[PDB]
C-alpha cells in the first residue's frame, strides 16, 4: 500500500521478523498476473515457517519483468538486481501506471544503463561513479570516454504495455532448519508424548513417538539430523525442551 | 453477495469466464469422437488401424 517504491538500483530491502504472515491477505491488493514461486508453491506458505524473510521493492518499465528470475540476463539482471540460481522465494508484479507515471514525464526512477561488470546477486551499487571507457581520467562530467550511467525512464500514461511502469516485489525466505520467526496464522495444539502421533513443528511434519532425550543443543540449533539426513530431534517453539523423534512400532 | 461490472472499468476489472472440459480417454465405449471419416473394415491382412 505504499505510494512510491524505489529505483531498481536502490531497491529498499524490508526485513520482516517476529510476526505471522497470512499471505492470503496479499491477493486482495492489485492484480497479480505473475505470482511465481521458484522454490515453493504459492499455497504452502501459510503452512510453513521461515528463518529470515525479506521483501525487495522496485519499479521497472514492464518489458523487463521477465529478467527478475533465476538465470535471467539483461540490464536489470546484470547491473541493478540479480537473483541466485538457488533462490527460494516468490516474485510478484502489477501495473502502476496511475501511480508511478506522470504526463509531464517522471524522472525519479533509474536503471544504471552501464557498469564496469555484472553486479552480483543481492548486491547494490548506488554509487554515482561515472563510468570511464577510455584511458584519460574523467573531468567529473560525462565526456567522449566517460558517460553518465544513471539513466532514467520517462514514464508517461500514453505509453503502451511493455513500457508502462510495473511494480515488482521479491519475497525471499530461507527454509533451512534454523530458528523460525514467521509461521502464519496456523493454530497450536497441546503436546502429546510417548505415543505414535503426527507432529507439525515449524515446517517439519512426520510420524513418530517423542521421548524428550538429553540432547543439549546450542542457542542457534533447532533441529538434528541423523546419518540419512532424517530429523531425529526438535526444539519446542513455545518452550526450551529438546524432544527426540523416533519411528513408531 | 453479488459482483458488478461496468464498461468504464479498465483492464482486469473487465468480466472473464472459465470452462473446464473434463474428458475420459481410457478403454471404454465411446460416445463422442472427432470428425475423422470412417473407412472400410479391411480384414485378414496386415494393416494399420
Amino acid at each position: 500500500n505504499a505510494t512510491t517504491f524505489a529505483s531498481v538500483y536502490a531497491w529498499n530491502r524490508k526485513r520482516i521478523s517476529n510476526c505471522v504472515a497470512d499471505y492470503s491477505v496479499i491477493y486482495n491488493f492489485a492484480p497479480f498476473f505473475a505470482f511465481k514461486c521458484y522454490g515453493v508453491s504459492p499455497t504452502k506458505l501459510n503452512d510453513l515457517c521461515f528463518t529470515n524473510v525479506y521483501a525487495d521493492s522496485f519499479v521497472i518499465r514492464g518489458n523487463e519483468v521477465s529478467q527478475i528470475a533465476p538465470g535471467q540476463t539483461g540490464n536489470i539482471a546484470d547491473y541493478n538486481y540479480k537473483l541466485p540460481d538457488d533462490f527460494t522465494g516468490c516474485v510478484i508484479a502489477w501495473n502502476s501506471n496511475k501511480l508511478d507515471s506522470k504526463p509531464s514525464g517522471n524522472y525519479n526512477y533509474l536503471y544504471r544503463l552501464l557498469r564496469k561488470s555484472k553486479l552480483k546477486p543481492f548486491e547494490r551499487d548506488i554509487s554515482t561513479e561515472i563510468y570511464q571507457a577510455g584511458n584519460k581520467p574523467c573531468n567529473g562530467v560525462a565526456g567522449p570516454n566517460c558517460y553518465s550511467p544513471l539513466q532514467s525512464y520517462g514514464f508517461r500514461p500514453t505509453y503502451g504495455v511493455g513500457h508502462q511502469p510495473y511494480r515488482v516485489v521479491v519475497l525471499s525466505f530461507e527454509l533451512l532448519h534454523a530458528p523460525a520467526t514467521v509461521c502464519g496464522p496456523k493454530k497450536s495444539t497441546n503436546l502429546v508424548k510417548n505415543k505414535c502421533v503426527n507432529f507439525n513443528f515449524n515446517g517439519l511434519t512426520g510420524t513418530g513417538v517423542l521421548t524428550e532425550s538429553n540432547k543439549k543443543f546450542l542457542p542457534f540449533q533447532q533441529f538434528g539430523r541423523d546419518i540419512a539426513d532424517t530429523t531425529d530431534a526438535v526444539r519446542d517453539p513455545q518452550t526450551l525442551e529438546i524432544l527426540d523423534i523416533t519411528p513408531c512400532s | 453477495q453479488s459482483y458488478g461490472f461496468r464498461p468504464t472499468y479498465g483492464v482486469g476489472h473487465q468480466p472473464y469466464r472459465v470452462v473446464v472440459l473434463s474428458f475420459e480417454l481410457l478403454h471404454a465405449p465411446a460416445t463422442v469422437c472427432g470428425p475423422k471419416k470412417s473407412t472400410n473394415l479391411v480384414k485378414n491382412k496386415c494393416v494399420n488401424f
Partner: antibody
Amino acid sequence: QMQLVQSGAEVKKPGESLKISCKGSGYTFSYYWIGWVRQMPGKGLEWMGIIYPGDSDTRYSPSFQGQVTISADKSISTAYLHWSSLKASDTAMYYCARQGDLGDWILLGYWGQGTLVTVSS
Amino acid sequence: SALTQPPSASGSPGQSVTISCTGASSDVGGYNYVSWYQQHPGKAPKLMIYEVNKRPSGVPDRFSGSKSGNTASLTISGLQADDEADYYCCSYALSRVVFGGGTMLTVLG
C-alpha cells in the same frame, strides 16, 4: 493556465442525494488524479477520496467509503461528488484538489475554491 | 497513529518561529511524507511544503521544513501581519492521506 471551478453554495433538506461538481481546465484532466477534502466549521481538513478521470479508478477514504460517491466526466473534464441519503451532520465545506507536475501522485498540490453545504432539516 | 500538532503558536513580525508535528508513518518508499498547507480565513488552502527538505516552485523562501525521528518541524524565517492562518501537517506514506489536527498562528496584538 490551470484553473478549477466548483459548484456554488447549496442549502437543502436531508434525504436528497446532493451532487456537487468540480470543473477544471488548462490541463490533461484525463491523466491527473482528482479528489475531495472535507472540513467542518471550526475543524481541520479531512481526506474524502480520489478519482483517476482516465478511467473508473477511484479510491475513497476508509471512513467515507460509501458515505458518498465521486464521479467525473472525461468528455468535459468535470468531477462530481454525488451523495446518497444525506444526513444533517454532513454540513461542511468541501474542497476538490489534484496533483501538480511535481510531488507524489496524491500530494494534492492544487486545490479548488470550495463548496459550502448545509443539509439541515 | 493519527497526526498531532500544538494547539497554536505566537510570534511577532521579523521573528523566526517554528511549528512541530508528531505521529507520522513510514513505508518502503522513505520517510519524507510530510506536507504543510496554509489556509487563510475563509478561502481555499494552499500547498506550502512537500518533501520537507524541498518545497513547490514559486514558494517564498520565508518558510522551511525539516524532520527528526517521528517528529517534523516547519521553520519560518520571519512572520508578517498577513501570516495569521491555520497550518496542517499531512502524511501520505501508505497511500492514505491523514491530515493533521491543525494549529493556529498569531502575532502579538
